[PDB]
Amino acid sequence: LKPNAATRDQLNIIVSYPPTKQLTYEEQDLVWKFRYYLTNQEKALTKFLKCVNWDLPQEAKQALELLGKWKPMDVEDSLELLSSHYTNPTVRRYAVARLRQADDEDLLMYLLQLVQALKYENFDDIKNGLEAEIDSSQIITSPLPLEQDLCTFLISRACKNSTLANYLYWYVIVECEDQDTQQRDPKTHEMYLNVMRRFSQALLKGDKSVRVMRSLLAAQQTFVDRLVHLMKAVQRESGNRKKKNERLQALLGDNEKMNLSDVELIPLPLEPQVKIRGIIPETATLFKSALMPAQLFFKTEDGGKYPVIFKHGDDLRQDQLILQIISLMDKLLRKENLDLKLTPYKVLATSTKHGFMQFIQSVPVAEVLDTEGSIQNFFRKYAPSENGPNGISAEVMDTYVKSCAGYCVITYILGVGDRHLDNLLLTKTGKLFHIDFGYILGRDPKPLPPPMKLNKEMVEGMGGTQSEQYQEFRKQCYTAFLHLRRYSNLILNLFSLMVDANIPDIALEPDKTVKKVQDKFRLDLSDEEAVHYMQSLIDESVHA
Numbered sequence: 390l391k392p393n394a395a396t397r398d399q400l401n402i403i404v405s406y407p408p409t410k411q412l413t414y415e416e417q418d419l420v421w422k423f424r425y426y427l428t429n430q431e432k433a434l435t436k437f438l439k440c441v442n443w444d445l446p447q448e449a450k451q452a453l454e455l456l457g458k459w460k461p462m463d464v465e466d467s468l469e470l471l472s473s474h475y476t477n478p479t480v481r482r483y484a485v486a487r488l489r490q491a492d493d494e495d496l497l498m499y500l501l502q503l504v505q506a507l508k509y510e511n512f513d514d515i516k517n518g519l520e521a522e523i524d525s526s527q528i529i530t531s532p533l534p535l536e537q538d539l540c541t542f543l544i545s546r547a548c549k550n551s552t553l554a555n556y557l558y559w560y561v562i563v564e565c566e567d568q569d570t571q572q573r574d575p576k577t578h579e580m581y582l583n584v585m586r587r588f589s590q591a592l593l594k595g596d597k598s599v600r601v602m603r604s605l606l607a608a609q610q611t612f613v614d615r616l617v618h619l620m621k622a623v624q625r626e627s628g629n630r631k632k633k634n635e636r637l638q639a640l641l642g643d644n645e646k647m648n649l650s651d652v653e654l655i656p657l658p659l660e661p662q663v664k665i666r667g668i669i670p671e672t673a674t675l676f677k678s679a680l681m682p683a684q685l686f687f688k689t690e691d692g693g694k695y696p697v698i699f700k701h702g703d704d705l706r707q708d709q710l711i712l713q714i715i716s717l718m719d720k721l722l723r724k725e726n727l728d729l730k731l732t733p734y735k736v737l738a739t740s741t742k743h744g745f746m747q748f749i750q751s752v753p754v755a756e757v758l759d760t761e762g763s764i765q766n767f768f769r770k771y772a773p774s775e776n777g778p779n780g781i782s783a784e785v786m787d788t789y790v791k792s793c794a795g796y797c798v799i800t801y802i803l804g805v806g807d808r809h810l811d812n813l814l815l816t817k818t819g820k821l822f823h824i825d826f827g828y829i830l831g832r833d834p835k836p837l838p839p840p841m842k843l844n845k846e847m848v849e850g851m852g853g854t855q856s857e858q859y860q861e862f863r864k865q866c867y868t869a870f871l872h873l874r875r876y877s878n879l880i881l882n883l884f885s886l887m888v889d890a891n892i893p894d895i896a897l898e899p900d901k902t903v904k905k906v907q908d909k910f911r912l913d914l915s916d917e918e919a920v921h922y923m924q925s926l927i928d929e930s931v932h933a
């Protein structure tokens with residue numbers, strides 16, 4: 390009923406393990422033995438529930454009396470309980486009970502994963518909450534004249550928060566529209582339709598503002614359906630990029646026919662806090678790309694311009710997951726008082742065949758080099774300073790060093806491949822950032838890719854390997870690395886809820902996907918060994 394000094398050390402080794410590590414039979418027996426002692430350690434509860442054989446009624450019974458007797462679990466840890474591993478209704482209800490403790494800010498960071506976790510819920514209980522044959526896109530547009538589960542909870546919070554409602558809407562829409570899920574997992578497709586029917590029904594039962602949320606959601610779906618129709622017409626248009634652009638601007642201009650240039654204020658699906666009046670027809674063009682994505686400028690509520698990239702005939706879900714992870718990693722780093730001037734641009738899939746991206750005015754590194762000669766020359770042109778380092782503004786140099794460090798570590802951890810200089814972007818304020826995440830988690834079009842994403846010209850832009858800026862780069866690389874290792878339990882749990890998400894590079898090897906991320910962290914190394922390891926990576930990458 391109480392362990393010795395040696396046993397308490399062995400127990401501490403187990404509790405510290407990543408959520409992925411498989412507890413050995415011997416480790417399991419040790420956790421089951423001192424299960425009453427561990428009740429004071431909130432971080433041990435996850436290790437305890439991984440010992441239980443839920444198929445054995447007596448093991449399940451003992452395990453649940455201890456769950457109510459334990460020190461309440463953290464919010465980051467409750468994400469482990471909502472995975473495919475747990476079927477026990479009492480455990481899954483407990484996870485929702487501890488998630489309820491998070492604020493909406495935190496809930497939005499985890500919501501993409503929470504929609505995926507509905508795949509592990511009781512489908513009948515979802516169906517009973519209601520009071521091909523059904524078109525998912527037409528639910529919201531066709532209105533008719535330990536107690537909460539994941540579906541009830543998410544809907545409860547969505548009805549109180551408009552930002553949360555928008556993302557719950559579009560995330561569930563993409564899930565219903567998934568053809569793979571329709572063919573291979575019909576009962577799952579039926580569940581998602583039921584989450585949408587229950588969402589519509591709850592909004593229709595709400596107050597003045599809650600009923601208007603459903604109108605707004607319908608107006609958004611209708612707008613997106615019209616934009617898709619225009620995209621198909623432009624993509625079909627016979628001729629060159631100019632023929633297609635003229636057709637694009639003409640259809641956008643004809644507001645009576647298409648209703649895209651003049652609309653009553655609606656939330657931009659990509660970022661719902663930004664209300665829009667419509668698309669500016671005149672500045673709308675197609676990108677050179679053979680995929681024919683369009684650049685569209687939205688007229689905002691308060692007289693601004695919000696440039697967007699709308700893609701048609703492409704699945705944006707891989708880029709969506711990566712940009713919400715980059716957004717989360719930036720949020721944890723800022724929490725830890727480290728602002729690395731990162732660019733977590735918004736991405737929102739509106740279906741498996743189309744979606745939005747937030748356009749950030751920038752110049753590819755390739756173009757910078759092939760027009761100005763060097764990054765330092767570019768910076769000297771647009772941001773000069775007499776007193777500044779190398780005749781470049783000090784702020785621009787600090788932004789460039791900080792962003793280079795941030796993306797270097799982030800793209801290392803996420804195993805981002807296909808890293809040429811056309812998909813590495815630079816801003817006149819010094820912001821370096823990555824785009825086009827078609828290859829992640831070790832994948833690359835060419836064989837044996839390098840683990841770190843550095844090059845000659847990048848270090849040149851800092852003022853070479855002998856500069857003070859290059860020293861600060863190193864300091865910021867290893868500092869950010871340690872910070873992200875502290876949040877490894879959170880990062881690994883969110884990646885664990887994505888194993889069945891139909892993300893191409895995840896779908897490849899679902900079983901091996903989370904260990905691929907876990908390895909990058911080098912949790913086997915102490916914080917001091919990690920600092921050296923990160924510098925070895927940098928030095929080996931800069932020299933090669």
Ligand SMILES: CC(C)OCCN1c2nc(N3CCOCC3)cc(=O)n2CC[C@H]1C(F)(F)F
Pocket residue numbers: 676677678680682698708734746747748749750751752753814824825826
């Ligand atoms: C430099 C820029 C004009 O290059 C456009 C390149 N462009 C693109 N821009 C992204 N940005 C989002 C973040 O702000 C910048 C643009 C993200 C992204 O996925 N892509 C994929 C390749 C092409 C296109 F046209 F096919 F979509």
